[PDB]
Amino acid sequence: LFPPQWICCDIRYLDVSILGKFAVVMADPPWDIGTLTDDEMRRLNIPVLQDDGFLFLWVTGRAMELGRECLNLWGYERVDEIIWVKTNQLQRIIHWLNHGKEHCLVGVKGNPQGFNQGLDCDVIVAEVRSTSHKPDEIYGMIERLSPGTRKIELFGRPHNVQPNWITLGNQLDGIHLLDPDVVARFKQRYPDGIISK
Amino acid sequence: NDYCQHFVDTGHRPQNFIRDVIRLKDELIAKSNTPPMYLQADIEAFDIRELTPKFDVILLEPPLEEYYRKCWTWDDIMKLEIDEIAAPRSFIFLWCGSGEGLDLGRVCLRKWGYRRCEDICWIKTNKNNPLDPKAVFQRTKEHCLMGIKGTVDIDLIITEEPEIGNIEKPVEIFHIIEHFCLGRRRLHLFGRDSTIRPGWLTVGPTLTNSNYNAETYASYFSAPNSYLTGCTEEIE
Ligand SMILES: CC1(C)CCN(Cc2ccc3[nH]c(C[C@]4(O)CCCN(c5cc(NCc6ccccc6)ncn5)C4)nc3c2)CC1
After folding, report:
1. Is A21 annotated as a binding residue?
2. What is the effect of changing residue 171 to A (chain A)?
3. Measured between alpha carbons, how far is A117 from B135 in angstroms, rounded to an integer?
């Protein structure tokens, strides 16, 4: 379990029922603002991934509205909104206005218990790395919120892989699965080891 | 340097460590500003239609229950007929707090006929001072959503957490609006005596004096001043 696991794949086509239930889902989707259409986004099978937990959903532009929509369709209530203030290595800030921040919606589903609500604040301050590259502070925040629990990231890239996290994304390097029950349900669902349509 | 870890350790919000917080344009705005006008009105009980003309900019600062730790619920706000006093091409700036208003205020914008184009965040430092039940994190910001209908600055305002019970929003919001140069008929709903400001009509229940006259107000925008940006010369 504990060490980073991942799956290179098209998240549209993967049968995420094999992966089980997670205390936290994080998604950083390629909103159409290799992107996904709004219907493709609305159709993702997020609802099977959780019973009681949180969803972290990166948004920008009109995805700010659309992400709220997917968030509610998938069965979550938006209860927080993190913003990451973008700085350089000297802690200064990098249509109508220039943008100094990225938004991440926080959704709750069910009734999660045993989480440490209230340890971090809803503002992150941290340096920009690659274009499209998220700050590692979010993993620290998510760890303090729900420590030791299983977490899944959608549309992550290789640098995003983390302990306790299963990463899905089409630019990862193949498949790397260590959780036995997940290896089991994977082999049952994908015996010849391919995932299309 | 993990500023979130640091905040968990010390009580210092990450924004505490952001460093570092054109003139002639301010002069041009200040020159073309109408005299401040203001009217005491109980907005729930007041037909907003007798505020004329239609406005180019609306700054809407309803008193949210969450600001206190007469309040207006989003139920009340959503029933305001904002679309009846907005110019066909106009802009709205709506303070939504940090809770459900982030969603309900977006409903309002669409209800009144606007689409969101900016999400301006007021980030509140606690350098001088190291919970909603639904909350997952400590809330250290408020959002002011910007709307457009029809056809320099950044989207962050950083200041210290005001004293408890102080509901004032940072005056920087006004600079941001005015630097957009969106027109001269500017309305601030639920302003206060403390927010009255040249270039602005203020309507709100706690104002102590009124000077508003609909004809005097319309005076300021008659030809040849009908379509000014507020960022240009006075027409001699
Ligand atoms: C914190 C932020 C600043 C981080 C950046 N954020 C915006 C952003 C920017 C760049 C990103 N780069 C990826 C990783 C991905 O791999 C890139 C490539 C397609 N990705 C898919 C797509 C997919 N299905 C459809 C498909 C498949 C093949 C060919 C075409 C279409 N299946 C699995 N991965 C996803 N996420 C990103 C998010 C803002 C906040």
Report:
1. no
2. Slight reduction in methyltransferase activity. Strong reduction in methyltransferase activity
3. 7
By C-alpha distance, the chain B residue nearest A55 is B136
Whole-angstrom CA distances from B227 to B37, B182, B203, B215, B220 are 19, 10, 23, 18, 11
Q: Where are the alpha helices (DSSP H) in B73-213?
A: 74-78, 101-111, 172-180
Set of chain A residues whose Cβ sits within 8 Å of the Cβ of B139:
80, 121-122
Answer whether B48's CB lies under 8 Å from B84's CB: yes
Residue B7 domain flag: no
User: Is the peptide bond between A29 and the residue preceding it cis, with omega within 30 degrees of 0?
Assistant: no
d(CA A133, CA B29): 40
Identify whether B15 is part of a domain. Answer: no
Residue B189's SS3 state is strand
SS3 B107: helix
Domain extent for B86: 22-121+143-152+163-219
Is B86 within a domain?
yes
Do the chains contact at A118 and B138, CB–CB below 8 Å? yes
| Nearby residues of A37 by Cβ (< 8 Å), 6 or more positions away | none
Is B233 within the bounds of a domain?
no
- Resolution of the experimental model in angstroms, please? 2.5
**Closest residue CA from atom 32 of ligand 1:** A10
Residue A51's φ and ψ, nearest 5 degrees, are -115, -50
Whichever domain contains B34, its CATH number is 3.40.50
Peptide bond into B170 cis (omega under 30): no
The answer to whether the CB of A155 is under 6 A from ligand 1 is yes
- Report the domain count for chain B: 1
